[PDB]
Amino acid sequence: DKWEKEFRIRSYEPYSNIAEWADKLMTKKYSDLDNPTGISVKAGDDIIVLVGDTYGQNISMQCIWETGTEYKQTASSGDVYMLNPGVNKLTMKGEGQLFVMYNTELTSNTAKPIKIHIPLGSGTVNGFFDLKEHKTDEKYAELLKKSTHKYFCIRGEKIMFYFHRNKLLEYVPNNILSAIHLWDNIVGWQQELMGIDDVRPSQVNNHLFAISPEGSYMWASDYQIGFVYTYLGNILLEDNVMAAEDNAWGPAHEIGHVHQAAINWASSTESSNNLFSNFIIYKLGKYKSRGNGLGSVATARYANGQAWYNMGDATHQNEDTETHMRMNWQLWIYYHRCEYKTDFWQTLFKLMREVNMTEGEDPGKKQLEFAKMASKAANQNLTDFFEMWGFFEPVNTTIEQYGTYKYYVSDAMIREAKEYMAQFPAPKHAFQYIEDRKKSEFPSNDYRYSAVGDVGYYTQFKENQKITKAITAELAGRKVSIQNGDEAVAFELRENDENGKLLYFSTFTTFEIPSSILMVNAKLYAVQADGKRILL
Numbered sequence: 001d002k003w004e005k006e007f008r009i010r011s012y013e014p015y016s017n018i019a020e021w022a023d024k025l026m027t028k029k030y031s032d033l034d035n036p037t038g039i040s041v042k043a044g045d046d047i048i049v050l051v052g053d054t055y056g057q058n059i060s061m062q063c064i065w066e067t068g069t070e071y072k073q074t075a076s077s078g079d080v081y082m083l084n085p086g087v088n089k090l091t092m093k094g095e096g097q098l099f100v101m102y103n104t105e106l107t108s109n110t111a112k113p114i115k116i117h118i119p120l121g122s123g124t125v126n127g128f129f130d131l132k133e134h135k136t137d138e139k140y141a142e143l144l145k146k147s148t149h150k151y152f153c154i155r156g157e158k159i160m161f162y163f164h165r166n167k168l169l170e171y172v173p174n175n176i177l178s179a180i181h182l183w184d185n186i187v188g189w190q191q192e193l194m195g196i197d198d199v200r201p202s203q204v205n206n207h208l209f210a211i212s213p214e215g216s217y218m219w220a221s222d223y224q225i226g227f228v229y230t231y232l233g234n235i236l237l238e239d240n241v242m243a244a245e246d247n248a249w250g251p252a253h254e255i256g257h258v259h260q261a262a263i264n265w266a267s268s269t270e271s272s273n274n275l276f277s278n279f280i281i282y283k284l285g286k287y288k289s290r291g292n293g294l295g296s297v298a299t300a301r302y303a304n305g306q307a308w309y310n311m312g313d314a315t316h317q318n319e320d321t322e323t324h325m326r327m328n329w330q331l332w333i334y335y336h337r338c339e340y341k342t343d344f345w346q347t348l349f350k351l352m353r354e355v356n357m358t359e360g361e362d363p364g365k366k367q368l369e370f371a372k373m374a375s376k377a378a379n380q381n382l383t384d385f386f387e388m389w390g391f392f393e394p395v396n397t398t399i400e401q402y403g404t405y406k407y408y409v410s411d412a413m414i415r416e417a418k419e420y421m422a423q424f425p426a427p428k429h430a431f432q433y434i435e436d437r438k439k440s441e442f443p444s445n446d447y448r449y450s451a452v453g454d455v456g457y458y459t460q461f462k463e464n465q466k467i468t469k470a471i472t473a474e475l476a477g478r479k480v481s482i483q484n485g486d487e488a489v490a491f492e493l494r495e496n497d498e499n500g501k502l503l504y505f506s507t508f509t510t511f512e513i514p515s516s517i518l519m520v521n522a523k524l525y526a527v528q529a530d531g532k533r534i535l536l
């Protein structure tokens, strides 16, 4: 049959080396299971493999099956059989599906497809579905029907699925294109921010590989990402992925953990990956962004005297991810959504890969390398943004987040960072006050309704709105009421004058000043989008 031949006789394309690129790109390891054969085996099977010209390349065959004591899951490795040009005869130490391991430097003129024939009689043809080669749902459906193994492999452009046959048949017996295009796009959108088009796919072309463990929930790790087999209806059906906000968030967040290291430092590990989560949500086009309002920052910084590392986490027991995740996102909203620098994040990723600091080696140092590199990437002095976000508080402590780390930010380190950042021109806007949400977008029962404030929506920045009205303020007790201030982007309490230190801020047009704020010498300013402060 032509079905057997399609899998028994194939050309296997070269893929890059995963360890090399995980180091270079500062990611968790991608998969090296890029090359299914679609042949399953049983323990003791004899397998003839005829191999063509290998062009000097060392290649091998790996048999992939299951691991785990508590419950079973597809393993990231298995029995490996060396291959040579010509005739090979393998005896399978165990059962599984075969993968050709052809990993090499892609730019070499020896990195050509290798032809490999596993003739009738050796193992069983299961098949797999290639997006580029097979193209149609009708062919997917046909291949899935003819398959027999526990697991069936679907190879997209950027992600693969290696899921339980019975689950695919249960949710997607006749169609895969919608599913595989969606998940390729989710991966591709994360890669888009990382600014790696110079090297992907020319030098790096490995896939992410999604397995369906028989336990846990969802996660991403070196080699594989996992979604429990009971959860696949919420992966394989786009309508289900889109049915609630969380259904794209969770998986996008887990994939983000693969990609976050360049920009991440301990204290930030469960928020920095939400740059990716929020970008996925944005690209999917249905739901508004996630995170607290800027009020949470004001409270942490100015009411409670917190820095970045302990923002919203006084007792030092859990990162405040809902507050922290707004920081990277505000940089995306301003530079990307407002189009002030549409390659800002790609530039910043590149610079952080140059900085090349692990997440834990020196988080206080890394926090300041991030502020410096953000300034360099924007070609703007982001002192005020990083000040609001707590980056210029001195710190001398330890933290715990997937390990204990010494957190040390010295006055000198602070001084050096500000000096470095002062080489760039003043920012064009006070976008530390930016939002991509407004109150009218949410029902009153949604956390964002009461959190997002009144002013500072991104259009005020993109259109460079000016304050033209007769803006006034009244103080009654600790209550500030602003009149005619809807054109401003925020309201600030500052010491002595507009160049004095910030005491408090709000993006609400009515707000209570905390008891802890020191009000002697304090003046109230409306902030214009471009940074002008107007005494009220």
Ligand SMILES: [Zn+2]
Pocket (backbone or CB within 6 Å): 253, 254, 257, 270
């Ligand atoms: Zn996480």
